[PDB]
Amino acid sequence: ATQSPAPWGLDRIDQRDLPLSNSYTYTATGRGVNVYVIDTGIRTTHREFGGRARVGYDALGGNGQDCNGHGTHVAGTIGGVTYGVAKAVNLYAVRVLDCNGSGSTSGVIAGVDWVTRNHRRPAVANMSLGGGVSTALDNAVKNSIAAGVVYAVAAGNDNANACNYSPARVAEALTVGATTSSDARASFSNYGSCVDLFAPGASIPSAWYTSDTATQTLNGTSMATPHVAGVAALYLEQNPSATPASVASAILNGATTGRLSGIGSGSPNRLLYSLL
């Protein structure tokens, strides 16, 4: 099916080169695959989700609904009917951050462990968050991936080496940096050898929590990451038996190479491509 016109980030990833086509083509929808958004929650009644969003877990005593905006926004780029890569996935809120988007690492780990024990295959988890080095968080994400869940995580927005952050530095997770519509590294994006690939992450429009119709445009590696989660869901729809290692390998081998500018030392020149 082809969506036209389309949000620029969707637009960019179904082609290798500029200029943008104002169209996003998809041969899969992620139907039947379960995406766990570990974030500030999700406004599940937002019209972008058409009943496909539900709450899985809330580490803060609440009901899993978003009161910040970020989780809803992220969920929309993954699976919203207009703003989403994979327009028919199942979305699950795993709420580990408060209305101000803050939370202890302990609560983040609680949500990662919940996904490990409660996910259903095929399963994708999105972590559009990051912080200083934490071996306990790294280990909980590695254990979740060993259990069979594909993880996409933000590289971080420090304009720094991504290996210095958790869970960005986990080798087994897909670690995602941000680019602009000119195919350059966004000026805030972390980079280097712990980054696995880049995806659109500046001026990304998606859903917001303040109403069932609200939208917002945002910048960050948190916005790049859900594009990659969405593509993992596309792949798993057609290959539901694939291990996280094989999914990562399909996306990285299929990635567009050589098109990016300013990506930094040690960074791979790889841009997400959806038509795997």
> Which residues, listed in sequence order, are joined to residue 218 by a DSSP beta bridge?
204
Q: How far apart are CA 190 and CA 177, in angstroms?
A: 6
| Among the listed residues 88, 87, 154, the one whose alpha carbon sits nearest the alpha carbon of residue 125 | 154
Residue (151 or 208) nearer to Ca ion, CB: 151
Q: How far apart are CA 257 and CA 79, in angstroms?
A: 25
To the nearest whole angstrom, how small is the minimum distance from the Cβ of residue 140 to Ca ion? 15
Active site residue 46: no
Residue (15 or 139) nearer to Ca ion, CB: 15
To the nearest whole angstrom, how small is the minimum distance from the Cβ of residue 59 to Ca ion? 24
To the nearest whole angstrom, how small is the minimum distance from the Cβ of residue 240 to Ca ion? 23
| Catalytic-labelled residue, pool 14, 39, 58, 66 | 39
Q: How far apart are CA 3 and CA 11, in angstroms?
A: 9
To the nearest whole angstrom, how small is the minimum distance from the Cβ of residue 2 to Ca ion? 9
DSSP 180: -
The DSSP-derived string for 184-211 is BB-TT--BSTT--EEEE-SSEEEE-SSS
To the nearest whole angstrom, how small is the minimum distance from the Cβ of residue 4 to Ca ion? 8
Residue (90 or 256) nearer to Ca ion, CB: 256
| Catalytic-labelled residue, pool 222, 227, 267, 274 | 222
Residue (23 or 210) nearer to Ca ion, CB: 23
Residue (60 or 260) nearer to Ca ion, CB: 260
To the nearest whole angstrom, how small is the minimum distance from the Cβ of residue 239 to Ca ion? 21
Residue numbers of the site for Ca ion (CB under 5 A)?
11, 14-15, 21, 23, 173, 175, 196
Query: Rounded to a whole number, what is the largest CA-CA distance in the chain?
Result: 47
Give the H or E element holding residue 132. strand 131-132
Active site residue 138: no
Active site residue 227: no
Which residue of the chain is nearest Ca ion when measured via CB? 175
Residue (45 or 245) nearer to Ca ion, CB: 245
Which three-class secondary structure string do you get for 204-254? EEEECCCCCCCEEEECCHHHHHHHHHHHHHHHHHHCCCCCHHHHHHHHHHH
DSSP 139: H
DSSP 271: E
Structure tokens at 126: 């999105």
| Catalytic-labelled residue, pool 46, 58, 66, 70 | 70
Q: How many residues does the chain have?
A: 276
Residues classed as catalytic? 39, 70, 222
